[PDB]
């Protein structure tokens, strides 16, 4: 269904964006705890 | 305390106070039975509730 | 110094994310006409 | 032989007043329904 | 980046105003379209 | 012996912003699911097929009129499991058949269990007595008697409360009209417990705030307290004299005072719970038989009791057909009870 | 013995530990939803029911001048104009039963205006 | 304190806002579209304003059988032309 | 015989087991990674 | 009979007020 | 000293006197059962099991005796209508007597155990202190229970060595005590299959024996012993209370919904049988069958058993009573004397009309008559001035088929209306309202009262479980918390793990 | 009024039995030194 | 006669009320907001019929 991709696309772009911005600190935290 | 014949007879049945098996003992086994029991309950509930409907099981006064 | 992804982080977002989504949905509903 | 587990019992006056008030108010409440 | 840049009172203000906007929208909706009795 | 159980126990009981604990495993999903369930339903789900009612924001209802309504009377007391024989795994149908109601009520029940286990768990970790949990027994008694036992006594879930503001109001009015619930002495005890509770809350709070010791120089008295101070922050002696002279009696024991504040509303709620358990069976405090015999024989005998019965009869006749659509009540205008003119 | 005897009228020291209670309730919810100031706590105990009952009283006092509860009777209408009932309308049905039966002999004219 | 970064610390940081000035509007728009595309109706089986009744009908499509409820609703939906 | 509802029962059973299982597997994993200091 | 009962209980409660107020345990400071 | 609400705590470390108290409680309960049975027997009218069975008469324990095979009096009557029976010793009176005597014996034993409380048996052999080994005690008691359960199932219920149990047809017409074979298939879990009751007690009994042997021979694991505080008898109080409110909710439920162990001839019909017109459907089915076989209306209806008709009447619905409407149902609508017969209403055009039956929810209900298609055709109007459906306008008559009024037709509006008013209650009966000075207001049956009492007790006992469980797990802080509680144990972050001082 | 006559004794006992209970407890408390 | 339609409502114990049904009945609708002290009545019987006690109380 096209409406499902239409509705999910903003959220997926949001998730991708926050991942883009937070990834280095995230791997820093994951590595630190390990 | 006062001793009696019946008391002396029963005395060993009340002599292991505080005696335990070390660690977890048969706890795993117990857990299993509890699991089983839960499913059993779930079944008889859902049969009674008509959420679980079995062939030949007519949950009604018109059972016999 | 501080962790980013914690239990508190997860608790906050399980409530916050659907909340903003829902607010968007209800906002949209205000323009529905019979 | 005297049992060593015996304990004295108490009810102070304030507890007497509270208790009497509870019983009497409960009676005042339920009596209508008892008479019906 | 470093926590503390954007003054809290500004954040509070913008947030509050957002709340007022959305709730205002809902009250507007009480008088228009669905559920408006018209 | 540091096995996996003990390691897990370590992690669950870490001092974090939101304490988890073992109880948390039950509490958090269930609570979350109940809340989400009510939010989803009231936002999106109709009551058209079960009640003939709109009940969501999506349909035009507002915060007061939205609800997650009970299932159709035809469902009986079905668990209405998503994968059950009624919905058969169909999410949409499940929503239209009232599945969200059992979903919310059941996850809510287990959620409450979880919360009280949480009270016990934290109490045990911190070293305090578990009176908060014990007190919480009362909300659980209420919830269980009203949302589970009461419909279980009746024909179906349909007559349980629906989860909404106006829906609950309807529940109230229904209990007046059909059960004469205001006449029930168990409800009366509940009312006494709740209002007595509110009263104690106000009066204890005000008394403490108005018998404060001057422990600071500022006109805001809040600053002049320290959580670790040993001294009492207000004068029990002055409080005692004030109330003894105003009202005749006063507390003199602080422990007894706070216990009493526990006792009153908890007990009230438990009593109302018992009454509702009676109403599950229609075991009502509906009539006074002596009144009815006298009034039947004596058309000049009138009391507020007979007056209220006339009101109940009106409520039943006028709300039943729309409130109980499955019954297909057709009440011609001519049979409707009405006073003159109205 | 009763725990209450652990408190003696007029004693200078507090009879419970507010830090323990705070630690407990604060972990029950989260830290910043628990009072650590007994004064501000007791003030809250005072204020909430008092303000609430003020509003209840104002409710009765303003409905005394017939500024009444929300009316959503037939607020929801479908595309054709059919009334879609809500719980508000069910409430209205019950309200109607009350209205028509109350003081059954006292009204001669069709509106009960007081 | 329990070790987590203080909220006041986070919600006044530039980074928090870089992230959330995107993620929040995106969710909002996602929900908005969830309604505006009509997807919500079909997901939850809520009637649209023109589908509570058939054109001449005034009876409610009330479910009256426990185990055939699904079929009943489907039938009702068929009868909507 | 396996009625449709008996099948439904087994599906509910397996769903619950999978939910609990994943939950506890995650919990145990995290517990083993992020240990308390003594 | 009922009336006598109701009024009796009531009267007992008023008597109880009297005693609880004037013949109470005195609060004693310690 | 002890506050009034703790006086019984003196028994906690005194096994002998604990046993004396338990003996006294048991004596009291047995005495209650005996006295209750004697009272019922002194008031029970056995003369009409059809229209005046025990559940109309406020009988509470009589049905529990009947359920397990005690159906007879020494005076020569039985609850199923037989006369001249010899029930042997185990008549109602015999059962009552045996409970009274048991009560006396338990009283004497209670005295003995009260006076001779200091028995060596109650002392721990190593420490000399009073001690009960609860795990082994549990094994022993569980084994005994398993034995009893098994024997009850295998000998009593089957009739191998015993009477069996009350069983009936689906409409509760022909109930009697019968030996019951176990049902070993899935229908064994059908609450309406009594074979399942039998099977349950045999299987659960064996399981209880096995489990009992296990708990006799295998000690608790250290971690469960500590966690559950198995050295503390109050833990047993808590879990026992839990089991007991569990059980209580279950018997409340099966009493309300019905099952093979709550027969309608002993406790009365369920509310749901009225909700779904259970009896009306069977009545109609039989009548249709007769008409099919060429019988006349009068024949078809006169063939309907009064018992069956009496079930199809809302006055026997347990959801019609009231909390303070006391006594037997006979005290409400009266002592049923006879079926008046089935009322058939017709209008001027000769259409058959049907009275809308009263739903259990309503204390009162309008009188409304429809045709087969549910169209309103007549009623008893409230406002007369715009009445269109009055019996007078519609020329409504009533004719009776079967019962004492068989063959009669009434045409005067007041009479027809009287019968329509009765018709909202279902089938119509003649009642003796004089004998008991019945007040005309519906009361609930033993099914209702049982269900109410046990739902309420189950709920209260939940609180009991909470209270004692708490006391067990928090015994160390019962009198209050540590005066030296370190502020840092309760403040945040000091310990990594809450409450664990080793994690600072 | 046709009240249930048992009401009388039901009420009387309802008041007397527990009240007496309390009174016993109170008096023997006072008579202790 | 609370509602002023010569339809007197019984509120006292002696006149067929129990604790739950009993009341001091509001003064008559015919009086409205008029002040009705005892001395405005021609007799105590009048005063009682019209619900004066409610106002005094
Ligand atoms: C974590 C705590 C928790 C608890 C206590 C519950 C409890 C419940 N859920 Mg909820 N749920 C949860 C979390 C929880 N849920 C989560 C995280 C989700 C999102 C996935 C859901 C999503 C959800 C939905 C969509 C629904 C429920 C429903 C329910 C109710 C029925 C449950 C049932 O019958 O399962 C039975 C399963 C078990 C009891 C598992 C026991 C496992 C045993 C002990 C082990 C043996 C299994 C064995 C290996 C399997 C063999 C299979 C083989 C024979 C084929 C019950 C109130 C239903 C409901 O509310 O109906 C109205 C429903 O429709 N839940
Ligand atoms: C092997 C053959 C066999 C057969 C044919 C039976 C047959 C039966 N068993 Mg038995 N059983 C057996 C072996 C067998 N059993 C064995 C080996 C054991 C292990 C010892 C058991 C243990 C057992 C238990 C514990 C129970 C049964 C019950 C039953 C009856 C179920 C029908 C019913 O009325 O459920 C009615 C009961 C339920 C459907 C379960 C209710 C579960 C509740 C709802 C859980 C929630 C409780 C909660 C606190 C309620 C509060 C919330 C509420 C207020 C809203 C039926 C006679 C049940 C019974 O006696 O019913 C009268 C029952 O409770 N059996
Ligand atoms: C399981 C319990 C139980 C049940 C279900 C029954 C059921 C029945 N009894 Mg039996 N009975 C019982 C135990 C029970 N009995 C006991 C223990 C006794 C010895 C006293 C009796 C002695 C007895 C006699 C002498 C008679 C009956 C009769 C009956 C029948 C009529 C019931 C009735 O009118 O009650 C009416 C019920 C009420 C009015 C409800 C009482 C509500 C209480 C008072 C509320 C108390 C509130 C409390 C004070 C609140 C405290 C608050 C505080 C904690 C803060 C009915 C079949 C009658 C019958 O028909 O015989 C053939 C009859 O004559 N019973
Ligand atoms: C197997 C059942 C059982 C047993 C053996 C006990 C035993 C005990 N309870 Mg527990 N309790 C129970 C169930 C039980 N309880 C239930 C169901 C509840 C919820 C109501 C409680 C709530 C409770 C509280 C809040 C407390 C106890 C306490 C106690 C201890 C002291 C009791 C005492 O001295 O009272 C003495 C009682 C009296 C002198 C008069 C009581 C009069 C009652 C209220 C009315 C009369 C009842 C009537 C005669 C019998 C009706 C029988 C009924 C089952 C049908 C004792 C260990 C106390 C404790 O822990 O001490 C440290 C305590 O504070 N219990
Ligand atoms: C309507 C009245 C009412 C509400 C809303 C309420 C709410 C609450 N009470 C709580 C506590 C208490 N209440 C207590 C005594 C009382 N509580 C009372 C009445 C209420 N109490 C009364 C009258 C008393 C006097 C005895 C005590 C002693 C406590 C606590 O200790 C505890 C607390 O912490 O207070 C600060 C909290 C439990 C938190 C929780 O369980 O999270 C978990 C959430 C779960 C498990 C979800 C529950 C799901 C519910 C049951 C069904 C679904 C409901 C929908 C989501 C919403 C429906 C809304 C419509 C009806 C309009 C919560 C704030
Ligand atoms: C030692 C003292 C013991 C007694 C204390 C004093 C009693 C106080 C009053 C309690 C009983 C009040 C009964 C109503 C008045 C009356 O006259 O009844 C009178 C009724 C008897 O009913 C009579 O029966 C006659 C024929 O036998 C006639 O029909 C009479 O008209 C009819 O009134 O008494 C009972 O039947 C009660 C028996 C017990 C039934 C209990 C079932 C419910 C129990 C669960 C409730 C638990 C609630 C816990 C809440 C917490
Ligand atoms: C300023 C707003 C006033 C709102 C109404 C009054 C609220 C306070 C009165 C409660 C009386 C309780 C009995 C006495 C209890 C008592 O003795 O109080 C004592 C308490 C402390 O007294 P202090 O002497 O320290 O301070 C008061 C003065 O002396 C000034 O310092 O007084 C206050 O805290 C006043 C707070 C003013 C600001 C309060 C704002 C609260 C309203 C917030 C908005 C809520 C709206 C909700 C709508 C849905
Ligand atoms: C309604 C509640 C109002 C509380 C008072 C208003 C907050 C404002 C206040 O009084 O203090 C202000 C306070 C400031 O916190 P900070 O920035 O100093 O945070 C420091 C900590 O992170 C250090 O560990 O705000 C908060 O702590 C967060 C507020 C809620 C944040 C959302 C958390 C949600 C968690 C999920 C729910 C868990 C429930 C658990 C039990 C079931
Ligand atoms: C059911 C279900 C589920 C779940 C889901 C969920 C979990 C959801 C969630 C959801 C959510 C979570 C939602 C939310 C929402 C929110 C909202 C909607 C909010 C709103 C708010 C507002 C509007 C506000 C207001 C206010 C107030 C209240 C006060 C202050 C002021 C103001 C005005 C701000 C699942 C899938 C599992 C399965 C199926 C079924
Ligand atoms: C000595 C002796 C003898 C005798 C014995 C006897 C004679 C006995 C009797 C016994 C009895 C005769 C008993 C009885 C009992 C009873 C009871 C124990 C009851 C109780 C009751 C109750 C507890 C109730 C309560 C209530 C009320 C009142 C109200 C309502 C509610 C209720 C239910 C809660 C002989 C010769 C044999 C031999 C040996 C010696
Ligand atoms: C649910 C409780 C099940 C505990 S199981 C327990 O777990 C230990 C590790 O914690 C193992 O070392 C031990 O062998 C095992 O029996
Ligand atoms: C302790 C004194 C009680 C004595 C009562 C003994 C009754 S014995 C009883 O009596 C009946 C007489 O018809 C017989 O039917 C029955 O078979 C017989 O067991
Ligand atoms: C004018 C009355 C003519 C019809 C008779 C009334 C319907 S039938 C009537 O109903 C009574 C209950 O009210 C019973 O007590 C009585 O036994 C029964 O004959
Ligand atoms: O409720 Mn309706 O509206 Ca205020 O008056 Mn007009 O009838 Mn009457 O006097 Mn009492 O009450
Ligand atoms: Ca249009
Ligand atoms: Cl009125
Ligand atoms: Cl008028
Ligand atoms: Fe306080
Ligand atoms: Mg709108």
JSON list of C-alpha atoms in Angstrom, two decimals, chain F residues 74-200:
[
{"chain": "F", "resi": 74, "resn": "UNK", "atom": "CA", "xyz": [-23.46, -10.85, 21.90]},
{"chain": "F", "resi": 75, "resn": "UNK", "atom": "CA", "xyz": [-19.77, -11.42, 22.73]},
{"chain": "F", "resi": 76, "resn": "UNK", "atom": "CA", "xyz": [-20.76, -12.51, 26.24]},
{"chain": "F", "resi": 77, "resn": "UNK", "atom": "CA", "xyz": [-17.70, -12.63, 28.48]},
{"chain": "F", "resi": 78, "resn": "UNK", "atom": "CA", "xyz": [-15.32, -13.57, 25.68]},
{"chain": "F", "resi": 79, "resn": "UNK", "atom": "CA", "xyz": [-11.67, -12.82, 26.35]},
{"chain": "F", "resi": 80, "resn": "UNK", "atom": "CA", "xyz": [-11.80, -11.45, 22.81]},
{"chain": "F", "resi": 81, "resn": "UNK", "atom": "CA", "xyz": [-8.22, -12.47, 22.16]},
{"chain": "F", "resi": 82, "resn": "UNK", "atom": "CA", "xyz": [-6.88, -11.12, 18.87]},
{"chain": "F", "resi": 83, "resn": "UNK", "atom": "CA", "xyz": [-6.14, -14.70, 17.77]},
{"chain": "F", "resi": 84, "resn": "UNK", "atom": "CA", "xyz": [-9.43, -15.88, 19.22]},
{"chain": "F", "resi": 85, "resn": "UNK", "atom": "CA", "xyz": [-12.45, -17.37, 17.44]},
{"chain": "F", "resi": 86, "resn": "UNK", "atom": "CA", "xyz": [-14.28, -14.06, 17.09]},
{"chain": "F", "resi": 87, "resn": "UNK", "atom": "CA", "xyz": [-11.60, -11.86, 15.53]},
{"chain": "F", "resi": 88, "resn": "UNK", "atom": "CA", "xyz": [-9.62, -14.77, 14.10]},
{"chain": "F", "resi": 89, "resn": "UNK", "atom": "CA", "xyz": [-6.39, -12.80, 13.90]},
{"chain": "F", "resi": 90, "resn": "UNK", "atom": "CA", "xyz": [-7.95, -9.87, 12.08]},
{"chain": "F", "resi": 91, "resn": "UNK", "atom": "CA", "xyz": [-6.78, -6.65, 13.74]},
{"chain": "F", "resi": 92, "resn": "UNK", "atom": "CA", "xyz": [-9.39, -4.45, 12.09]},
{"chain": "F", "resi": 93, "resn": "UNK", "atom": "CA", "xyz": [-12.34, -6.70, 12.96]},
{"chain": "F", "resi": 94, "resn": "UNK", "atom": "CA", "xyz": [-10.91, -7.08, 16.45]},
{"chain": "F", "resi": 95, "resn": "UNK", "atom": "CA", "xyz": [-11.06, -3.30, 16.84]},
{"chain": "F", "resi": 96, "resn": "UNK", "atom": "CA", "xyz": [-14.62, -3.21, 15.49]},
{"chain": "F", "resi": 97, "resn": "UNK", "atom": "CA", "xyz": [-15.72, -6.05, 17.78]},
{"chain": "F", "resi": 98, "resn": "UNK", "atom": "CA", "xyz": [-14.47, -4.32, 20.95]},
{"chain": "F", "resi": 99, "resn": "UNK", "atom": "CA", "xyz": [-11.20, -6.25, 21.38]},
{"chain": "F", "resi": 100, "resn": "UNK", "atom": "CA", "xyz": [-9.47, -3.17, 22.68]},
{"chain": "F", "resi": 101, "resn": "UNK", "atom": "CA", "xyz": [-11.75, -3.17, 25.69]},
{"chain": "F", "resi": 102, "resn": "UNK", "atom": "CA", "xyz": [-10.64, -6.58, 26.98]},
{"chain": "F", "resi": 103, "resn": "UNK", "atom": "CA", "xyz": [-7.10, -5.70, 25.88]},
{"chain": "F", "resi": 104, "resn": "UNK", "atom": "CA", "xyz": [-7.07, -2.57, 28.01]},
{"chain": "F", "resi": 105, "resn": "UNK", "atom": "CA", "xyz": [-8.95, -4.09, 30.96]},
{"chain": "F", "resi": 106, "resn": "UNK", "atom": "CA", "xyz": [-6.70, -7.16, 31.15]},
{"chain": "F", "resi": 107, "resn": "UNK", "atom": "CA", "xyz": [-3.35, -5.49, 30.49]},
{"chain": "F", "resi": 108, "resn": "UNK", "atom": "CA", "xyz": [-4.60, -2.90, 32.98]},
{"chain": "F", "resi": 109, "resn": "UNK", "atom": "CA", "xyz": [-5.34, -5.53, 35.61]},
{"chain": "F", "resi": 110, "resn": "UNK", "atom": "CA", "xyz": [-1.92, -7.11, 35.24]},
{"chain": "F", "resi": 111, "resn": "UNK", "atom": "CA", "xyz": [-0.44, -3.63, 35.17]},
{"chain": "F", "resi": 112, "resn": "UNK", "atom": "CA", "xyz": [-1.99, -2.85, 38.54]},
{"chain": "F", "resi": 113, "resn": "UNK", "atom": "CA", "xyz": [-0.64, -6.12, 39.90]},
{"chain": "F", "resi": 114, "resn": "UNK", "atom": "CA", "xyz": [2.74, -5.04, 38.56]},
{"chain": "F", "resi": 115, "resn": "UNK", "atom": "CA", "xyz": [2.53, -1.64, 40.22]},
{"chain": "F", "resi": 116, "resn": "UNK", "atom": "CA", "xyz": [1.71, -3.09, 43.61]},
{"chain": "F", "resi": 117, "resn": "UNK", "atom": "CA", "xyz": [4.54, -5.64, 43.23]},
{"chain": "F", "resi": 118, "resn": "UNK", "atom": "CA", "xyz": [6.71, -2.61, 42.44]},
{"chain": "F", "resi": 119, "resn": "UNK", "atom": "CA", "xyz": [5.66, -0.98, 45.69]},
{"chain": "F", "resi": 120, "resn": "UNK", "atom": "CA", "xyz": [6.62, -4.15, 47.56]},
{"chain": "F", "resi": 121, "resn": "UNK", "atom": "CA", "xyz": [9.92, -4.53, 45.70]},
{"chain": "F", "resi": 122, "resn": "UNK", "atom": "CA", "xyz": [11.06, -0.98, 46.23]},
{"chain": "F", "resi": 123, "resn": "UNK", "atom": "CA", "xyz": [9.86, -1.04, 49.85]},
{"chain": "F", "resi": 124, "resn": "UNK", "atom": "CA", "xyz": [11.99, -4.12, 50.46]},
{"chain": "F", "resi": 125, "resn": "UNK", "atom": "CA", "xyz": [15.06, -2.64, 48.75]},
{"chain": "F", "resi": 126, "resn": "UNK", "atom": "CA", "xyz": [14.92, 0.67, 50.62]},
{"chain": "F", "resi": 127, "resn": "UNK", "atom": "CA", "xyz": [14.01, -0.71, 54.05]},
{"chain": "F", "resi": 128, "resn": "UNK", "atom": "CA", "xyz": [10.58, 0.80, 54.69]},
{"chain": "F", "resi": 129, "resn": "UNK", "atom": "CA", "xyz": [7.34, -0.95, 55.73]},
{"chain": "F", "resi": 130, "resn": "UNK", "atom": "CA", "xyz": [5.05, -1.88, 52.84]},
{"chain": "F", "resi": 131, "resn": "UNK", "atom": "CA", "xyz": [2.03, 0.23, 53.85]},
{"chain": "F", "resi": 132, "resn": "UNK", "atom": "CA", "xyz": [1.90, 2.03, 50.52]},
{"chain": "F", "resi": 133, "resn": "UNK", "atom": "CA", "xyz": [1.30, -1.27, 48.72]},
{"chain": "F", "resi": 134, "resn": "UNK", "atom": "CA", "xyz": [-1.27, -2.28, 51.31]},
{"chain": "F", "resi": 135, "resn": "UNK", "atom": "CA", "xyz": [-3.02, 1.04, 50.75]},
{"chain": "F", "resi": 136, "resn": "UNK", "atom": "CA", "xyz": [-2.96, 0.41, 47.03]},
{"chain": "F", "resi": 137, "resn": "UNK", "atom": "CA", "xyz": [-5.03, -2.72, 47.63]},
{"chain": "F", "resi": 138, "resn": "UNK", "atom": "CA", "xyz": [-8.06, -0.42, 47.64]},
{"chain": "F", "resi": 139, "resn": "UNK", "atom": "CA", "xyz": [-7.74, 0.88, 43.99]},
{"chain": "F", "resi": 140, "resn": "UNK", "atom": "CA", "xyz": [-7.19, -2.73, 42.95]},
{"chain": "F", "resi": 141, "resn": "UNK", "atom": "CA", "xyz": [-10.39, -3.84, 44.73]},
{"chain": "F", "resi": 142, "resn": "UNK", "atom": "CA", "xyz": [-12.27, -1.05, 43.01]},
{"chain": "F", "resi": 143, "resn": "UNK", "atom": "CA", "xyz": [-10.89, -1.78, 39.58]},
{"chain": "F", "resi": 144, "resn": "UNK", "atom": "CA", "xyz": [-11.41, -5.52, 39.84]},
{"chain": "F", "resi": 145, "resn": "UNK", "atom": "CA", "xyz": [-14.94, -5.30, 41.24]},
{"chain": "F", "resi": 146, "resn": "UNK", "atom": "CA", "xyz": [-16.16, -2.64, 38.78]},
{"chain": "F", "resi": 147, "resn": "UNK", "atom": "CA", "xyz": [-14.41, -3.63, 35.52]},
{"chain": "F", "resi": 148, "resn": "UNK", "atom": "CA", "xyz": [-14.21, -7.41, 35.95]},
{"chain": "F", "resi": 149, "resn": "UNK", "atom": "CA", "xyz": [-16.50, -8.87, 38.61]},
{"chain": "F", "resi": 150, "resn": "UNK", "atom": "CA", "xyz": [-19.47, -6.61, 37.88]},
{"chain": "F", "resi": 151, "resn": "UNK", "atom": "CA", "xyz": [-19.79, -7.46, 34.16]},
{"chain": "F", "resi": 152, "resn": "UNK", "atom": "CA", "xyz": [-18.93, -11.10, 34.93]},
{"chain": "F", "resi": 153, "resn": "UNK", "atom": "CA", "xyz": [-22.06, -11.18, 37.10]},
{"chain": "F", "resi": 154, "resn": "UNK", "atom": "CA", "xyz": [-24.06, -9.62, 34.31]},
{"chain": "F", "resi": 155, "resn": "UNK", "atom": "CA", "xyz": [-24.82, -10.89, 30.80]},
{"chain": "F", "resi": 156, "resn": "UNK", "atom": "CA", "xyz": [-21.61, -9.71, 29.14]},
{"chain": "F", "resi": 157, "resn": "UNK", "atom": "CA", "xyz": [-18.72, -7.25, 29.12]},
{"chain": "F", "resi": 158, "resn": "UNK", "atom": "CA", "xyz": [-21.13, -4.79, 27.45]},
{"chain": "F", "resi": 159, "resn": "UNK", "atom": "CA", "xyz": [-22.38, -3.58, 30.81]},
{"chain": "F", "resi": 160, "resn": "UNK", "atom": "CA", "xyz": [-18.92, -3.00, 32.25]},
{"chain": "F", "resi": 161, "resn": "UNK", "atom": "CA", "xyz": [-17.81, 0.61, 32.29]},
{"chain": "F", "resi": 162, "resn": "UNK", "atom": "CA", "xyz": [-16.52, 1.87, 28.97]},
{"chain": "F", "resi": 163, "resn": "UNK", "atom": "CA", "xyz": [-13.22, 3.72, 29.16]},
{"chain": "F", "resi": 164, "resn": "UNK", "atom": "CA", "xyz": [-14.15, 7.34, 28.63]},
{"chain": "F", "resi": 165, "resn": "UNK", "atom": "CA", "xyz": [-15.32, 10.39, 30.52]},
{"chain": "F", "resi": 166, "resn": "UNK", "atom": "CA", "xyz": [-18.93, 10.57, 29.29]},
{"chain": "F", "resi": 167, "resn": "UNK", "atom": "CA", "xyz": [-19.10, 6.78, 29.10]},
{"chain": "F", "resi": 168, "resn": "UNK", "atom": "CA", "xyz": [-18.32, 6.67, 32.82]},
{"chain": "F", "resi": 169, "resn": "UNK", "atom": "CA", "xyz": [-20.95, 9.33, 33.52]},
{"chain": "F", "resi": 170, "resn": "UNK", "atom": "CA", "xyz": [-23.42, 7.05, 31.74]},
{"chain": "F", "resi": 171, "resn": "UNK", "atom": "CA", "xyz": [-22.23, 4.25, 34.02]},
{"chain": "F", "resi": 172, "resn": "UNK", "atom": "CA", "xyz": [-23.08, 6.39, 37.05]},
{"chain": "F", "resi": 173, "resn": "UNK", "atom": "CA", "xyz": [-26.55, 7.25, 35.77]},
{"chain": "F", "resi": 174, "resn": "UNK", "atom": "CA", "xyz": [-27.21, 3.63, 34.85]},
{"chain": "F", "resi": 175, "resn": "UNK", "atom": "CA", "xyz": [-26.32, 2.57, 38.38]},
{"chain": "F", "resi": 176, "resn": "UNK", "atom": "CA", "xyz": [-28.72, 5.12, 39.78]},
{"chain": "F", "resi": 177, "resn": "UNK", "atom": "CA", "xyz": [-31.60, 4.15, 37.46]},
{"chain": "F", "resi": 178, "resn": "UNK", "atom": "CA", "xyz": [-31.21, 0.39, 37.50]},
{"chain": "F", "resi": 179, "resn": "UNK", "atom": "CA", "xyz": [-29.45, -0.33, 40.78]},
{"chain": "F", "resi": 180, "resn": "UNK", "atom": "CA", "xyz": [-30.55, 2.59, 42.97]},
{"chain": "F", "resi": 181, "resn": "UNK", "atom": "CA", "xyz": [-26.89, 2.57, 43.89]},
{"chain": "F", "resi": 182, "resn": "UNK", "atom": "CA", "xyz": [-27.08, 5.77, 45.98]},
{"chain": "F", "resi": 183, "resn": "UNK", "atom": "CA", "xyz": [-29.36, 3.86, 48.39]},
{"chain": "F", "resi": 184, "resn": "UNK", "atom": "CA", "xyz": [-26.72, 1.19, 48.93]},
{"chain": "F", "resi": 185, "resn": "UNK", "atom": "CA", "xyz": [-25.05, 1.42, 52.35]},
{"chain": "F", "resi": 186, "resn": "UNK", "atom": "CA", "xyz": [-21.79, 0.04, 50.91]},
{"chain": "F", "resi": 187, "resn": "UNK", "atom": "CA", "xyz": [-21.68, 2.91, 48.46]},
{"chain": "F", "resi": 188, "resn": "UNK", "atom": "CA", "xyz": [-22.52, 5.20, 51.37]},
{"chain": "F", "resi": 189, "resn": "UNK", "atom": "CA", "xyz": [-19.52, 3.92, 53.27]},
{"chain": "F", "resi": 190, "resn": "UNK", "atom": "CA", "xyz": [-17.39, 4.49, 50.19]},
{"chain": "F", "resi": 191, "resn": "UNK", "atom": "CA", "xyz": [-18.63, 8.08, 49.94]},
{"chain": "F", "resi": 192, "resn": "UNK", "atom": "CA", "xyz": [-17.84, 8.57, 53.60]},
{"chain": "F", "resi": 193, "resn": "UNK", "atom": "CA", "xyz": [-14.35, 7.20, 53.03]},
{"chain": "F", "resi": 194, "resn": "UNK", "atom": "CA", "xyz": [-13.60, 9.37, 50.02]},
{"chain": "F", "resi": 195, "resn": "UNK", "atom": "CA", "xyz": [-15.03, 12.62, 51.39]},
{"chain": "F", "resi": 196, "resn": "UNK", "atom": "CA", "xyz": [-13.58, 11.81, 54.83]},
{"chain": "F", "resi": 197, "resn": "UNK", "atom": "CA", "xyz": [-10.29, 11.25, 53.06]},
{"chain": "F", "resi": 198, "resn": "UNK", "atom": "CA", "xyz": [-10.44, 14.55, 51.20]},
{"chain": "F", "resi": 199, "resn": "UNK", "atom": "CA", "xyz": [-11.38, 16.21, 54.46]},
{"chain": "F", "resi": 200, "resn": "UNK", "atom": "CA", "xyz": [-8.43, 14.67, 56.32]}
]
